[PDB]
Design a protein around this ligand. Structure first.
Ligand SMILES: C[C@]12C=CC(=O)C=C1CC[C@@H]1[C@@H]2C(=O)C[C@@]2(C)[C@H]1CC[C@]2(O)/C(O)=C/O
Length: 244
């Protein structure tokens, strides 16, 4: 039933509003992706608020969690869309904005694009189910926390365990087989941290020199990155890993 709720609140597809009549310069591609991000952010917040248990957390905890994990959430969903739509061959940012080889090249971030595509390829290798995907996604929202703790730790800890339990539910044949599956899926979750570190680095860099580099960011994103950046730079956040 918790999973049925996840399927119900899963956001609808978000379009980039991209104009293919324009040249695909790095400036336009990145500004276009950031505009898409702003629209996705709206969907993400509405989603977080509908998650059983999220509301129970303090308002500052809800805000902190979203700002620390939005990049992981969007990159993870990107991996899923790319998996279901292109079997991991292209990056399906949006129905109207699919990144092929040419776009990855002109984006100036080919390496990050391949890092994101690798997530999609892991979905392929593991044949991740929609249910596993949904549970894993919630876990990402709950896997980057303040080193000094949350105001609703008890509630947070409770919520996290419930969703981890839900994941094992989605996973469940043989017990050892289920254990192996949990091992593999959580390895994928842990792998998001290093990827996101690279995504955020380029995000903060272009954000800081937005005007100079002509890379536009919507206000929906500017507000969040403005506050998040110093917190991350100061090293206030830590990951909640599943493996050594
Ligand atoms: C959020 C986003 C776009 C929506 C989406 O489905 C997935 C992502 C993940 C990668 C993000 C990307 C954009 O936001 C543009 C970013 C943020 C890129 C990481 C580097 C980036 O290309 C950047 O820094 C351009 O300025």
């Amino acid at each position: 039933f918790l999973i049925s709720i996840l399927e119900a609140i899963e956001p609808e597809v978000v379009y980039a509003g991209y104009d293919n009549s324009q040249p695909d310069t790095t400036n336009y591609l990145l500004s276009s992706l950031n505009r898409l991000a702003g629209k996705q952010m709206v969907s993400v917040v509405k989603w977080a608020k509908a998650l059983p248990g999220f509301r129970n957390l303090h308002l500052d905890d809800q805000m902190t969690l979203i700002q620390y994990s939005w990049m992981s959430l969007m990159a993870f969903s990107l991996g899923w869309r790319s998996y279901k739509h292109t079997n991991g061959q292209m990056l399906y940012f949006a129905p109207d904005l699919i990144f092929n080889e040419e776009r990855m090249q002109q984006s100036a971030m080919y390496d990050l694009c391949q890092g994101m595509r690798q997530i999609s390829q892991e979905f392929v290798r593991l044949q991740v189910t929609y249910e596993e995907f949904l549970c894993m996604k919630v876990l990402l929202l709950l896997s980057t926390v303040p080193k000094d703790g949350l105001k609703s730790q008890a509630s947070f800890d409770e919520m996290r365990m419930n969703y981890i339990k839900e994941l094992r539910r989605a996973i469940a044949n043989n017990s050892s087989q289920n254990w192996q599956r949990f091992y593999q899926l959580t390895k994928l979750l842990d792998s998001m941290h290093d990827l996101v570190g690279g995504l955020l680095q380029f995000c903060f860099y272009t954000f800081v020199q937005s005007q100079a580099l002509s890379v536009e960011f919507p206000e929906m994103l500017v507000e969040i990155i403005s506050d998040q950046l110093p917190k991350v730079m100061a090293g206030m956040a830590k990951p909640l890993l599943f493996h050594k």
